[PDB]
Amino acid sequence: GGYNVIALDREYRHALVCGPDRDYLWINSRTPTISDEVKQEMLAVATREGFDVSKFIWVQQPGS
Amino acid sequence: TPPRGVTVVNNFDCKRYLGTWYEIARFDHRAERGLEKVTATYSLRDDGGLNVIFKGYNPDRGMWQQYVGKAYFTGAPTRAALKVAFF
Ligand code: NA
């Protein structure tokens, strides 16, 4: 299966990752939680590239 | 092949991507559905590929479970396009 980093900040702390098509997408962090600011920028990259962000499941993590 | 009309990162330093990433959000599929506290851990193979260790908590089985995979760059290691297999 295809695996592609389609966004990444400068200190490799936050990544947007998609599969071979727009049914596969993940938001990853070096920390268990991200900030709204960081969330909105991620959603904003997802939408700009045509991903249906209503499909996100917000995964249980320590502090969430 | 990546989806049609997407940007892939093109200045890519593999070594700096390694180690542990928490999964904040996912589009659901059978492989992951219901899993909690998910991380993926990336490490460099002898053959220049990446090892991928996916880990999550399974509340219905009451166990931590992992999936073991390998990833290969489809083009150059400076472009973050890859194929993943799990065995
Ligand atoms: Na908690």
Numbering used by the authors:
A (entry chain B): 114 to 177
B (entry chain A): 23 to 109
Provide passages from the article that reported this PDB entry:
Later, proteins capable of binding and increasing the fluorescent signals of fluorogenic molecules became commonly referred to as fluorogen activating proteins (FAPs). In silico shortlisting with the further screening of the lipocalin Blc mutants launched DiBs FAPs tags family binding green and red BODIPY dyes. It suggests that the easier task of fine-tuning the fluorogen-binding properties of an already functional protein in silico should be readily achievable. To test this hypothesis, we used Rosetta for computational ligand docking followed by protein binding pocket redesign to further improve the previously described FAP DiB1 that is capable of binding to a BODIPY-like dye M739. The designed protein, DiB-RM, shows higher brightness, localization precision, and apparent photostability in protein-PAINT super-resolution imaging compared to its parental variant DiB1.
Moreover, DiB-RM can be cleaved to obtain an efficient split system with enhanced performance compared to a parental DiB-split system. Despite no intentional optimization for it, the DiB-RM-based split protein (DiB-RM-split) created analogously to the previously tested DiB2-split system also behaved better. We have not observed aggregation in the separately expressed N1-109 fragment, and the split protein successfully assembled in living cells without the need of including the additional overlapping β strand in the C fragment. Regardless of lower brightness both in vitro and in super-resolution microscopy set up as well as less stable fluorescent signal compared to full-length DiB-RM tag, we speculate that the DiB-RM-split should be a scaffold of choice for further DiB-split system optimizations.
